[PDB]
């Protein structure tokens, strides 16, 4: 649109005449100039508005400098869905019968623009179109939703704090951000407190049952039941799940941006089982996408997913989900593009009344450090094909040097990706503790040493992050692979220590003739095998992990001699 307004139609005649554009444009027409929206809107007709001026309105309220037609379509579709929920609620009639809820609808549209800023506004030289992430989940995500079945709403992701001029402003939790001055009138605030709206709630100090009730209301689930409670449900995860649900229930394609460390599959499975509750039908459908996947199997799997989608919907009245993990490593990433962006599989249209939501993932596009590139090229014999002559690149850089071998994400997906988070390590250690308490089975193993195990796991993870390069971003993937290693080492830690003492007695002096913990030595083995085995700067790791170790192995020499002794034992 930005490059047609000057020289000149532009809008689709059948789409302007559609409600998905007429309703947002009608509301924007009434709101651009200042009129009370108490009048009855959405006549189920076509207003005397022009497609050109409609495009002008959506441009001046889209904010981003150079929007494609896809981004305008996303904005308008999202805004239409949200205003449809607003009209479906009895709050317009609530204001009519209250006669003092004035200023409610201007706040409604302003907050709509805010959450649209959230949703339909994203944004090395060749990685610049991809790695340049202006907004992360470490940003304000003000969210409001209208719960269909009942008459209670949910205001998540922000706070309402009394302003100095008598008003109430949007203050984000855990810090001070004073965005959106003068958004509402105090009569709306009074009517809201008359309506007992759950506004300005810090969800970090609310019970699991109550937060699940808040979700089920927000997720529109009636008679909620709690399917899983072994996963911590923080505020940011709530923001993510509501973001996904809004995205795929309004119509926006939902591509997921994040690294392997972040928990994405777990969260979507959580959402799917919350939607399902107790039916035995297969709702979530994981698809493992990898660097040998060709379009035939993706097309076939999507077809079978839509088949099982009819199966679920027609005779269960349920909504299912199909998921793709790291759906970027395939040379057929664009196949995922036509699957999800324009709703067409292998040239065949995907039915909106079938009942199915497609969610795909993506890896972050970032080049390795030159230090580990030297490490790789020096791994004995160098690579067969050098970088200048590698055919499978994305730009001027081979996939061999990237942190994930990921091909160029096609356009019309860049305006769609949105990051889940970097796993800031504030909740990393808690998840590690949960894993090490769930899968170690330490009912009677070590009442307090489990804290030490989790802490040294987090310390090693921080060592991995506190270094310019990493193997493959094995964050929260090597820990859930090494808890099992630790459990195995403890399970056989009985004859191992006996053989250790025998070997050290029959082949060494009295220095290695001391008792060792069945756990701490097992911890030394787990760190030696999962983490200390791979990296080539082992001295630094030995000196930077000896801190979290207790008295027997306070230094690097102790850890090294223990690992070497066990290798010699085997
Ligand atoms: N002039 C227009 N007026 C209204 N909507 C438009 C206009 N042009 C495009 N759109 C909207 O843009 C959306 C995306 O466009 P479309 O799928 O044709 O993109 P594309 O350029 O073919 O995609 P890609 O290059 O990613 O394959 C369509 O669903 C359509 O509704």
XYZ file of C-alpha atoms and ligand atoms in Angstrom:
601
model
C 0.000 0.000 0.000
C 2.716 2.529 0.860
C 4.030 2.291 -2.711
C 0.623 2.633 -4.390
C -0.954 5.517 -2.432
C 1.283 8.107 -4.100
C 0.602 7.294 -7.763
C -3.058 6.273 -7.333
C -7.421 0.402 -7.006
C -5.607 -0.963 -3.958
C -8.078 -2.857 -1.769
C -9.721 -6.138 -2.733
C -13.343 -5.288 -3.651
C -14.684 -8.554 -2.229
C -12.615 -8.073 0.930
C -13.542 -4.438 1.556
C -17.171 -5.470 1.145
C -16.514 -8.275 3.635
C -17.158 -7.777 7.333
C -13.575 -8.693 8.277
C -12.605 -5.307 6.816
C -15.877 -3.356 6.992
C -16.346 -3.758 10.751
C -12.782 -2.696 11.708
C -13.005 0.165 9.230
C -16.439 1.218 10.478
C -15.182 1.326 14.062
C -11.995 3.125 12.995
C -14.137 5.625 11.074
C -16.217 6.354 14.159
C -13.127 6.492 16.395
C -10.666 8.542 14.303
C -12.745 11.648 14.919
C -14.141 11.875 18.423
C -17.670 10.497 18.761
C -19.215 8.371 21.478
C -19.562 4.771 20.293
C -22.765 4.167 22.274
C -24.617 4.074 18.955
C -25.420 0.640 17.563
C -22.694 -0.376 15.094
C -22.199 -3.231 12.612
C -25.457 -2.978 10.648
C -24.446 -6.157 8.724
C -24.029 -3.863 5.717
C -21.486 -1.832 3.779
C -20.899 1.690 5.088
C -20.291 4.624 2.751
C -16.541 4.345 3.317
C -13.968 4.114 0.660
C -11.378 1.353 0.300
C -8.776 4.080 -0.212
C -9.634 5.941 2.999
C -9.968 2.588 4.766
C -6.404 1.827 3.721
C -5.389 5.301 4.913
C -6.890 4.624 8.349
C -5.284 1.211 8.686
C -1.954 2.699 7.599
C -2.023 5.612 10.039
C -2.911 3.207 12.853
C -0.608 0.355 11.778
C 2.440 2.343 12.919
C 5.141 0.403 11.094
C 6.756 2.447 8.346
C 6.529 0.126 5.311
C 3.759 -2.471 5.663
C 2.924 -5.149 3.136
C -0.656 -6.031 2.257
C -0.256 -9.106 4.466
C 0.490 -7.003 7.544
C -2.538 -4.770 6.929
C -4.667 -7.887 6.523
C -3.294 -9.266 9.806
C -4.039 -6.020 11.637
C -7.587 -5.782 10.336
C -8.414 -9.461 10.920
C -7.112 -9.350 14.494
C -8.973 -6.125 15.228
C -12.175 -7.535 13.717
C -12.009 -10.672 15.850
C -11.384 -8.680 19.015
C -14.203 -6.220 18.333
C -16.505 -9.139 17.541
C -15.816 -10.509 21.013
C -16.402 -7.021 22.437
C -19.774 -6.687 20.700
C -20.724 -10.255 21.634
C -20.277 -9.246 25.269
C -23.124 -7.458 27.038
C -20.873 -4.560 28.038
C -22.427 -2.162 25.528
C -25.831 -2.905 27.052
C -24.143 -2.884 30.472
C -23.088 0.720 29.823
C -26.560 1.513 28.473
C -28.205 0.193 31.656
C -25.517 1.690 33.897
C -25.677 5.132 32.251
C -22.261 5.906 33.790
C -19.838 3.537 31.984
C -18.865 6.301 29.548
C -15.311 6.228 28.251
C -15.310 2.428 28.104
C -15.184 2.006 24.331
C -12.404 4.518 23.635
C -10.328 2.572 26.146
C -11.443 -0.591 24.346
C -10.120 0.590 20.996
C -6.943 2.057 22.517
C -6.115 -1.236 24.210
C -6.949 -2.958 20.933
C -4.284 -0.829 19.260
C -1.863 -1.711 22.065
C -2.327 -5.456 21.759
C -2.120 -5.033 17.980
C 1.245 -3.335 18.511
C 2.026 -6.559 20.323
C 0.695 -8.976 17.725
C 0.652 -7.688 14.138
C 3.780 -5.490 14.315
C 7.169 -7.164 14.186
C 10.175 -4.987 13.353
C 25.622 -10.248 10.315
C 24.475 -8.621 7.079
C 22.669 -11.619 5.575
C 21.234 -12.637 8.948
C 20.019 -9.064 9.477
C 16.504 -9.769 8.081
C 16.243 -12.693 10.538
C 18.332 -12.143 13.673
C 17.303 -8.493 14.051
C 14.665 -8.993 16.748
C 13.464 -5.623 18.020
C 10.919 -7.069 20.460
C 11.283 -10.144 22.679
C 9.156 -11.528 25.481
C 11.301 -9.277 27.688
C 8.946 -6.467 26.651
C 5.508 -5.238 27.731
C 2.670 -7.474 26.525
C -0.567 -5.780 27.606
C -3.419 -8.239 27.044
C -7.190 -8.147 27.482
C -9.644 -10.900 26.523
C -13.417 -11.349 26.650
C -14.648 -14.657 28.065
C -17.581 -15.911 26.017
C -19.574 -18.336 28.151
C -19.623 -16.206 31.308
C -19.631 -12.460 32.039
C -16.146 -12.033 33.521
C -13.071 -10.737 31.691
C -9.330 -11.034 32.211
C -6.668 -8.308 32.148
C -3.227 -9.916 31.953
C 0.228 -8.552 31.190
C -0.020 -5.061 32.682
C -1.204 -3.037 35.675
C -3.587 -0.122 36.226
C -2.083 2.417 38.646
C -3.660 5.697 39.710
C -2.172 8.641 37.816
C -1.220 11.963 39.384
C -3.808 13.909 37.352
C -6.537 11.676 38.792
C -6.465 9.082 35.997
C -5.133 5.521 35.826
C -2.148 4.552 33.673
C -0.671 1.320 32.325
C 2.292 0.285 34.497
C 4.040 -2.968 33.659
C 4.772 -5.423 36.489
C 8.179 -5.790 38.164
C 9.306 -2.335 36.926
C 7.999 1.090 35.985
C 6.770 1.832 32.464
C 4.280 4.671 32.139
C 3.072 4.063 28.585
C -0.290 5.334 27.296
C -1.020 8.424 29.357
C -4.681 9.485 29.568
C -6.377 6.378 28.204
C -9.607 6.203 30.214
C -12.142 8.344 32.035
C -12.746 7.957 35.755
C -16.430 7.213 35.145
C -15.345 4.097 33.254
C -13.138 3.199 36.224
C -16.053 3.645 38.635
C -18.312 1.529 36.438
C -15.580 -1.102 36.240
C -15.256 -1.325 40.015
C -19.044 -1.568 40.083
C -18.733 -4.469 37.611
C -16.008 -6.122 39.752
C -13.686 -6.648 36.779
C -10.511 -8.621 37.599
C -8.221 -5.737 36.637
C -4.630 -5.080 37.738
C -3.785 -8.517 39.117
C -0.219 -9.639 39.773
C -0.397 -13.338 38.968
C 2.916 -14.309 40.582
C 1.170 -14.646 43.973
C -2.036 -16.446 43.007
C -2.734 -20.154 43.532
C -2.432 -22.785 40.831
C -6.152 -23.562 40.898
C -7.026 -19.867 40.617
C -4.544 -19.212 37.803
C -5.974 -22.227 35.983
C -9.466 -20.783 36.448
C -8.204 -17.487 35.020
C -6.765 -19.370 32.043
C -9.892 -21.450 31.432
C -11.997 -18.298 31.489
C -9.498 -16.653 29.139
C -9.218 -19.818 27.046
C -13.035 -19.975 27.081
C -13.151 -23.412 28.732
C -16.283 -24.377 30.663
C -16.202 -26.779 33.616
C -12.392 -26.658 33.799
C -10.392 -29.647 34.969
C -6.705 -29.678 35.754
C -4.846 -32.142 33.500
C -1.240 -31.405 34.465
C 0.352 -29.736 37.480
C 3.961 -30.940 37.125
C 4.880 -27.851 35.062
C 5.262 -24.422 36.630
C 2.843 -21.912 35.095
C 4.443 -18.479 35.360
C 3.074 -15.159 34.123
C 5.231 -15.141 30.982
C 4.042 -18.635 30.062
C 0.504 -17.330 30.517
C 1.307 -14.499 28.113
C 2.660 -17.031 25.616
C -0.348 -19.355 25.781
C -2.865 -16.533 25.445
C -0.788 -15.111 22.589
C -0.896 -18.426 20.730
C -4.606 -18.921 21.395
C -5.453 -15.414 20.186
C -3.218 -15.859 17.146
C -4.814 -19.074 15.917
C -8.359 -18.215 16.968
C -8.488 -14.893 15.137
C -6.797 -16.213 11.997
C -3.180 -15.034 12.027
C -0.673 -17.733 11.017
C 1.282 -18.822 14.073
C 5.013 -19.341 13.604
C 7.049 -19.718 16.794
C 10.430 -18.041 17.235
C 12.874 -19.407 19.780
C 15.827 -21.612 20.603
C 15.840 -25.256 21.696
C 16.297 -24.269 25.338
C 12.887 -22.628 25.603
C 9.965 -24.924 26.295
C 7.699 -24.659 23.253
C 6.396 -28.185 22.658
C 5.527 -28.507 26.342
C 3.537 -25.264 26.328
C 1.506 -26.063 23.216
C 0.809 -29.546 24.582
C -0.328 -27.842 27.788
C -2.710 -25.648 25.800
C -4.006 -28.624 23.810
C -4.780 -30.689 26.892
C -6.409 -27.684 28.569
C -8.647 -27.357 25.508
C -9.320 -31.104 25.547
C -9.656 -31.730 29.282
C -10.568 -35.421 29.417
C -11.468 -36.689 25.930
C -9.223 -39.496 24.682
C -9.027 -38.173 21.102
C -5.639 -37.109 19.760
C -5.605 -33.307 19.891
C -1.921 -32.384 19.740
C -0.072 -33.773 16.705
C 3.705 -33.386 16.846
C 5.640 -33.631 13.580
C 9.410 -34.010 13.757
C 10.825 -31.854 10.949
C 14.486 -32.408 10.100
C 17.078 -31.781 7.387
C 16.039 -34.669 5.159
C 12.325 -33.960 5.168
C 10.929 -33.542 1.655
C 7.619 -31.889 0.673
C 5.854 -35.198 -0.059
C 5.852 -36.335 3.562
C 4.889 -32.903 4.908
C 1.950 -32.726 2.495
C 0.861 -36.266 3.394
C 1.180 -35.592 7.132
C -0.844 -32.384 6.863
C -3.500 -34.310 4.936
C -3.680 -37.019 7.612
C -3.767 -34.312 10.279
C -6.773 -32.706 8.610
C -8.378 -36.155 8.375
C -7.963 -36.751 12.103
C -9.156 -33.157 12.516
C -12.485 -34.053 10.932
C -12.435 -37.153 13.123
C -12.077 -35.062 16.281
C -14.440 -32.223 15.359
C -17.379 -34.021 13.739
C -17.955 -36.650 16.432
C -16.322 -34.990 19.463
C -16.933 -31.247 18.936
C -13.289 -30.518 19.727
C -10.519 -28.350 18.283
C -7.214 -30.054 17.506
C -3.720 -28.783 16.728
C -0.978 -29.868 14.339
C 2.562 -28.857 15.249
C 5.901 -28.732 13.448
C 9.121 -28.478 15.434
C 12.173 -26.654 14.038
C 10.257 -26.426 10.763
C 13.089 -24.367 9.326
C 15.807 -26.991 8.849
C 13.909 -28.419 5.873
C 14.728 -27.228 2.390
C 10.915 -27.198 2.163
C 10.407 -24.470 4.763
C 8.451 -22.659 2.056
C 6.162 -25.690 1.985
C 5.345 -24.820 5.587
C 4.871 -21.270 4.321
C 2.114 -22.216 1.901
C 0.676 -24.577 4.512
C 0.192 -21.946 7.184
C 0.390 -18.438 5.687
C -2.181 -18.712 2.879
C -4.010 -21.930 3.885
C -3.264 -24.138 0.872
C -1.618 -27.575 0.900
C -0.025 -28.912 -2.301
C -2.326 -26.667 -4.314
C -5.429 -27.650 -2.329
C -7.238 -25.281 0.015
C -7.494 -26.084 3.720
C -11.059 -25.928 5.016
C -11.692 -23.404 7.788
C -14.720 -25.411 8.947
C -12.628 -28.585 9.205
C -11.245 -27.548 12.586
C -7.462 -27.474 12.896
C -4.730 -25.068 13.978
C -1.269 -25.243 12.424
C 1.679 -24.198 14.584
C 5.240 -24.349 13.268
C 8.525 -23.586 15.006
C 11.795 -21.994 13.912
C 15.365 -21.815 15.156
C 17.168 -18.502 15.732
C 19.402 -17.486 12.838
C 22.815 -16.688 14.278
C 26.360 -17.472 13.205
C 28.740 -19.373 15.452
C 31.744 -17.774 17.078
C 34.989 -17.815 15.126
C 36.647 -19.581 18.074
C 34.457 -22.658 17.725
C 34.734 -22.445 13.939
C 38.479 -22.834 14.436
C 37.662 -25.695 16.809
C 35.550 -27.430 14.150
C 37.948 -26.942 11.244
C 40.765 -28.222 13.477
C 38.885 -31.398 14.487
C 41.518 -33.660 12.990
C 41.141 -33.452 9.237
C 39.309 -30.349 8.101
C 36.004 -30.383 6.282
C 35.725 -32.104 2.909
C 34.359 -28.961 1.250
C 35.574 -25.585 2.445
C 33.277 -22.637 3.080
C 33.857 -20.904 -0.262
C 32.711 -24.017 -2.152
C 29.808 -25.215 0.030
C 26.607 -25.434 -2.010
C 24.046 -25.433 0.831
C 24.187 -21.916 2.247
C 21.554 -19.352 3.060
C 23.549 -16.293 1.969
C 27.292 -15.743 1.758
C 27.737 -18.042 4.790
C 27.458 -21.858 4.851
C 24.924 -23.654 6.998
C 27.940 -25.505 8.396
C 29.005 -22.406 10.353
C 25.523 -21.537 11.665
C 24.383 -22.426 15.173
C 21.424 -24.212 13.600
C 21.564 -25.309 9.977
C 18.527 -23.282 8.960
C 17.701 -22.091 5.473
C 16.383 -18.689 4.494
C 12.982 -18.145 6.008
C 10.904 -16.898 3.074
C 9.218 -13.497 3.279
C 5.609 -13.167 4.498
C 6.963 -15.176 7.435
C 9.315 -12.482 8.750
C 6.227 -10.311 9.515
C 4.912 -13.314 11.455
C 7.688 -14.678 13.692
C 7.647 -13.632 17.348
C 10.149 -14.796 19.939
C 9.217 -16.949 22.928
C 12.204 -15.980 25.055
C 15.871 -16.580 25.808
C 15.408 -18.518 29.088
C 16.983 -15.767 31.176
C 18.159 -18.370 33.765
C 15.799 -16.874 36.369
C 13.420 -19.788 35.756
C 16.078 -22.109 34.316
C 17.259 -23.330 37.715
C 13.669 -23.881 38.852
C 12.959 -26.054 35.807
C 16.205 -27.951 36.431
C 15.170 -28.509 40.052
C 11.771 -29.732 38.869
C 13.416 -32.179 36.458
C 15.910 -33.428 39.043
C 13.099 -33.905 41.563
C 10.744 -35.600 39.079
C 13.135 -38.030 37.372
C 15.852 -38.703 39.958
C 13.389 -40.268 42.447
C 15.214 -38.927 45.503
C 12.506 -39.867 48.012
C 15.413 -41.277 50.035
C 18.590 -40.495 48.106
C 19.839 -37.110 49.343
C 17.494 -34.740 51.220
C 19.612 -31.652 50.494
C 22.337 -32.611 48.001
C 19.746 -32.383 45.211
C 20.012 -28.619 45.639
C 23.762 -28.918 45.026
C 23.156 -31.067 41.937
C 20.690 -28.561 40.490
C 22.973 -25.643 41.339
C 26.008 -27.192 39.647
C 23.820 -28.074 36.653
C 22.821 -24.416 36.402
C 26.448 -23.377 36.910
C 27.561 -25.569 34.017
C 24.726 -24.224 31.882
C 25.846 -20.680 32.705
C 29.373 -21.700 31.722
C 27.916 -22.786 28.390
C 26.149 -19.439 27.996
C 29.048 -17.437 29.478
C 31.182 -18.394 26.481
C 31.184 -16.952 22.989
C 30.181 -20.273 21.417
C 28.197 -23.405 22.187
C 27.929 -26.852 20.627
C 24.348 -26.655 19.378
C 22.449 -24.633 21.980
C 21.903 -27.818 23.968
C 20.278 -25.706 26.680
C 17.554 -27.597 28.573
C 18.264 -30.605 26.347
C 21.546 -31.857 27.785
C 20.227 -31.369 31.332
C 17.213 -33.599 30.665
C 19.664 -36.041 29.075
C 22.102 -35.870 31.993
C 19.638 -36.292 34.850
C 19.206 -39.805 33.456
C 22.994 -40.211 33.386
C 23.157 -39.150 37.035
C 20.402 -41.580 37.994
C 22.224 -44.412 36.236
C 25.518 -43.490 37.909
C 23.843 -43.514 41.322
C 22.049 -46.802 40.609
C 25.406 -48.497 39.976
C 27.324 -46.343 42.486
C 27.667 -49.326 44.858
C 30.086 -51.721 43.157
C 31.709 -48.784 41.347
C 33.049 -47.287 44.580
C 34.244 -50.702 45.770
C 36.150 -51.191 42.516
C 37.454 -47.621 42.739
C 38.904 -48.283 46.187
C 40.323 -51.630 45.058
C 41.935 -50.109 41.960
C 43.395 -47.138 43.817
C 44.704 -49.425 46.563
C 46.222 -51.970 44.170
C 47.717 -49.400 41.785
C 48.272 -46.167 43.747
C 49.407 -44.699 47.061
C 47.260 -43.497 49.968
C 46.245 -40.149 48.427
C 43.308 -41.669 46.521
C 42.341 -43.835 49.505
C 39.407 -41.866 50.899
C 35.671 -42.435 50.953
C 33.591 -40.740 48.264
C 29.909 -39.857 48.281
C 27.658 -42.145 46.214
C 26.143 -38.898 44.909
C 29.049 -36.448 44.648
C 31.219 -38.900 42.721
C 28.181 -39.659 40.563
C 27.855 -35.905 40.047
C 31.512 -35.774 38.986
C 30.799 -38.528 36.474
C 27.653 -36.865 35.125
C 29.467 -33.567 34.595
C 32.453 -35.407 33.112
C 30.329 -37.300 30.604
C 27.584 -34.879 29.573
C 29.537 -31.599 29.636
C 33.234 -32.142 30.386
C 33.463 -34.711 27.586
C 32.800 -32.448 24.611
C 34.444 -29.039 24.934
C 38.118 -28.458 24.130
C 38.842 -25.734 26.731
C 38.547 -28.258 29.552
C 40.928 -26.404 31.887
C 38.621 -23.383 32.021
C 35.616 -25.593 32.736
C 37.498 -27.405 35.497
C 38.455 -24.100 37.115
C 34.979 -22.572 36.645
C 32.950 -25.506 37.984
C 35.078 -26.419 41.019
C 33.399 -23.557 42.907
C 29.986 -25.197 43.228
C 31.588 -28.480 44.281
C 31.788 -29.370 47.984
C 34.931 -30.001 50.038
C 36.322 -33.174 48.356
C 36.556 -31.590 44.878
C 36.993 -27.872 45.558
C 39.555 -27.553 42.736
C 40.267 -28.678 39.186
C 42.848 -31.307 40.148
C 40.334 -33.307 42.194
C 37.741 -33.436 39.407
C 40.378 -34.306 36.815
C 41.873 -37.123 38.882
C 38.443 -38.565 39.677
C 37.426 -38.611 36.008
C 40.771 -40.058 34.919
C 40.634 -42.725 37.631
C 37.176 -43.849 36.562
C 38.202 -43.964 32.903
C 41.221 -46.043 33.915
C 38.912 -48.299 35.931
C 36.794 -48.992 32.871
N -5.026 -4.976 -2.395
C -5.342 -5.743 -1.346
N -6.422 -5.407 -0.610
C -6.746 -6.171 0.438
N -6.133 -7.264 0.897
C -5.069 -7.570 0.150
C -4.612 -6.880 -0.960
N -3.481 -7.487 -1.483
C -3.283 -8.509 -0.688
N -4.204 -8.621 0.319
C -4.243 -9.651 1.347
O -2.933 -10.134 1.517
C -3.013 -11.488 1.988
C -1.723 -12.189 1.664
O -1.493 -12.026 0.249
P -0.955 -13.219 -0.634
O -1.228 -14.528 -0.010
O -1.506 -13.076 -2.047
O 0.592 -12.938 -0.710
P 1.786 -13.325 -1.684
O 2.539 -12.138 -2.120
O 1.191 -14.211 -2.773
O 2.663 -14.252 -0.766
P 4.102 -14.918 -0.745
O 5.069 -14.097 -1.518
O 4.445 -15.030 0.737
O 3.889 -16.310 -1.327
C -4.245 -12.080 1.312
O -4.915 -12.978 2.188
C -5.120 -10.856 0.979
O -6.333 -10.847 1.720
